[PDB]
Design a protein around this ligand. Structure first.
Ligand SMILES: NC(=O)c1ccc[n+]([C@@H]2O[C@H](COP(=O)([O-])OP(=O)(O)OC[C@H]3O[C@@H](n4cnc5c(N)ncnc54)[C@H](O)[C@@H]3O)[C@@H](O)[C@H]2O)c1
Ligand SMILES: NC(=O)c1ccc[n+]([C@@H]2O[C@H](COP(=O)([O-])OP(=O)(O)OC[C@H]3O[C@@H](n4cnc5c(N)ncnc54)[C@H](O)[C@@H]3O)[C@@H](O)[C@H]2O)c1
Ligand SMILES: O=c1ccn([C@@H]2O[C@H](COP(=O)(O)OP(=O)(O)O)[C@@H](O)[C@H]2O)c(=O)[nH]1
Ligand SMILES: O=c1ccn([C@@H]2O[C@H](COP(=O)(O)OP(=O)(O)O)[C@@H](O)[C@H]2O)c(=O)[nH]1
Lengths: 367, 366
């Protein structure tokens, strides 16, 4: 069911996996708008017309059914209202917006709130205003488990409607965005879906795209980066942020969901909003928690990395990183029931293997 | 305590009363920044150097202690970076910011959320960024009872500062996010902030020269008094919703005089100015400002009838979306910590000042 999709932040980690799924599993037209602030100012990995061509060229073998599928790339900031307007006009009519751009280092948001409120909140504001101006009535928003925080001061899978008590400015910025999108449904008829990803991880089976460790603030990429340093010719120990949490082993528990499963959820979300009609209205705004429903502590994740890489990965216990909730695991019944979401990755072992395959073949990232 | 104060939205209804209190009851320097979007693009009422000299000229009798006091006026949008930065630079150093600008029609925020999220949220964001850039560490923010919304399922009692926040409108959401942004700036940059939740602002300065004119107003009392004016200077007074979970079915509110709100800001300014390195836990504070008395829409109209002597015919209508059923304030902390002492209690006295201003201003300030 062809549809022209505008993917903000599409050159990023999760965005690249979503775009690839759009290009290989759908007939939608893809337009990416990214400032490249989260990609070191480069876009060699983006599946533009030229990049896709070079890939099919440099390599030999049966031409894939998606060999001619590519996305357009518009480089700029979504807060630059002029730039944004030009993108909607030149690539219009835009049927749906998938808003993935943001700053997402929870620890950094606590130290520099304004950087996060500006980019995260003003960014979604500008998109919503552009959608209204250009008659676009469908949006899929990248939310987070960070909107939940710790229980109001049993730890079990978090439901979509659990209380929202953000433990960081990052979480607050995602939460206000959901409120804004919700209010636009009632006021302007904008159909929106907020997908709360939990801990995104893994890499596409092809092993060519993923989250490089250099400059990363996330657990697994950092662990694998320590291995990339243990592999190199002779403190390289793996830092554990906080061991005094209200969890079984004292370290934070998270739900690691594969980026390819997150990608398929967006395709299902797009089909859902596209089928909504005027009688649905109460269904114009919906939220879904995306996770495997299984949790792993920081210690357990490191142990899986050790068994996946075959390396020692010496650790070192440190103090808590401000902004971190003790436990964040997802209950995804709504996503499974309503969207028909069917995650292919369940164990961290299989996920970790795809992350390692990508990292171990990219000592310098995409560079 | 000679402090230079930047008052955003200072040309407005509540801002004008706060500025007058600053000029007559303090020795602070006042700089007003306002786009005049809420004042019909005019500022004849603002107590600038010129406007104040005209009052003096027309006045007969000995000069008051505050005869020559005036405020500077910078006309522009706080969301305009170049403009805001220029104001901080030319009038600097700015010691404290009193952020009063915003759009505040609860009913309109439900119909047009983006207009409110933009102005209300981006406005406070720019001010906080400017404060950081220009080394300003003190801010007093105009919050609202709208951040509370309805109670989660009893006994309807005055609302405590830490009651659950369940905004019933985008307007309430915009005020709430501003409080969380200010709070996070305390922890991160050492910015000392106070969020004053005004409840239903009403009344007018005893002088009878400034207030909220009915033409273009979305608020209850100004609209009621406007119905009295139109008849003299349907045409029936509309009651929005009569099926609310209240004693008489209409919304209950806490009407607090703008002059009492003004004195609370002066007390708030003193509170943040006295904060030091040891008072980290006090860098972010919130206070609910109300009389603790509630009046339903029916009761307010009843008071207006007696105050004006006009029949004020009515027509019951449906609910205005975005309205909580009950909003009355418990002001224990404001009284205990700031030493706030409201001079107006009952609505009769308040209504009297509102009527005095309106009846003498058939065309507003025009
Ligand atoms: N990574 C996770 O575990 C996780 C979990 C929950 C939610 N999320 C959310 O998913 C989205 C994507 O995350 P990611 O891991 O792919 O991160 P990422 O940084 O790789 O992707 C974000 C992309 O957005 C771009 N961007 C940022 N601000 C922009 C702006 N103002 N204008 C244009 N482009 C801009 C960046 O250049 C980057 O390419 C974000 O909204 C993030 O908050 C991520
Ligand atoms: N009136 C009430 O009952 C009430 C209750 C609770 C909270 N508040 C808050 O108190 C404050 C003042 O309310 P008021 O009744 O005096 O309203 P008002 O409209 O008279 O005052 C607001 C002033 O801010 C200005 N303004 C708006 N956006 C601006 C911008 N972007 N840049 C520069 N100036 C801008 C307007 O021109 C206006 O002069 C607002 O923040 C309002 O939300 C009012
Ligand atoms: O070097 C690191 C990086 C992260 N973490 C922890 O691993 C968990 C996941 O952190 P991440 O930044 O990868 O994602 P988040 O849960 O903040 O969205 C959290 O408890 C972090 O404190 C850690 O112990 N050491
Ligand atoms: O013409 C009007 C205007 C307002 N109201 C009601 O009076 C109460 C106060 O409304 P207002 O806009 O003056 O202030 P708010 O409580 O929204 O901050 C609310 O229940 C309104 O619905 C009314 O019944 N008729």
């Amino acid at each position: 069911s062809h549809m022209r999709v505008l993917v903000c932040g599409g050159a990023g980690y999760i965005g690249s996996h979503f775009v690839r799924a759009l290009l290989r599993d759908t007939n939608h037209s893809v337009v990416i708008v990214d400032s490249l602030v989260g990609t070191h100012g480069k876009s060699d990995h983006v599946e533009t017309r030229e990049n896709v061509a070079r890939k099919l060229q440099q390599s030999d073998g049966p031409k894939p059914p998606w060999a001619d599928r590519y996305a357009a790339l518009e480089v700029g900031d979504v807060r630059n209202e002029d730039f944004l307007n030009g993108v909607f006009t030149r690539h219009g009519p835009i049927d749906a917006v998938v808003h993935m751009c943001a700053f997402l280092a929870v620890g950094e948001s606590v130290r520099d709130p304004l950087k996060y409120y500006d980019n995260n909140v003003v960014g979604i504001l500008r998109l919503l205003q552009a959608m209204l101006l250009h008659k676009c009535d469908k949006i899929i928003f990248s939310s987070s488990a960070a909107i939940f925080g710790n229980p109001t001061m049993n730890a079990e899978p978090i439901d979509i409607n659990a209380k929202k008590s953000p433990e960081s400015p990052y979480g607050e910025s995602k939460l206000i965005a959901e409120r804004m999108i919700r209010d636009c449904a009632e006021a302007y008829g904008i159909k929106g879906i907020c997908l709360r990803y939990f801990n995104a991880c893994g890499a596409h089976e092809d092993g060519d795209i993923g989250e490089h460790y250099q400059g990363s603030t996330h657990l697994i990429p950092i662990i694998l980066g320590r291995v990339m340093s243990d592999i190199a010719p002779d403190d390289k120990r793996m830092p554990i942020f906080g061991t005094d949490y209200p969890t079984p082993d004292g370290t934070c528990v998270r739900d690691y969901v594969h980026v390819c499963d997150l990608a398929s959820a967006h395709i299902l979300a797009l089909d859902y909003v596209e089928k909504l009609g005027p009688n649905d209205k109460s269904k114009y705004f919906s939220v879904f928690n995306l996770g495997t429903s299984r949790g792993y502590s920081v210690r357990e994740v490191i142990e899986v990395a050790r068994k996946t890489t075959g390396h020692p990965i010496p650790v070192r216990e440190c103090g808590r990183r401000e902004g971190d909730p003790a436990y964040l695991v997802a209950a995804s019944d709504k996503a499974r029931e309503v969207l028909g979401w069917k995650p292919k990755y369940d164990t961290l072992e299989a996920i970790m293997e795809t992350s390692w395959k990508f990292q171990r073949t990219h000592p310098n990232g995409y560079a």
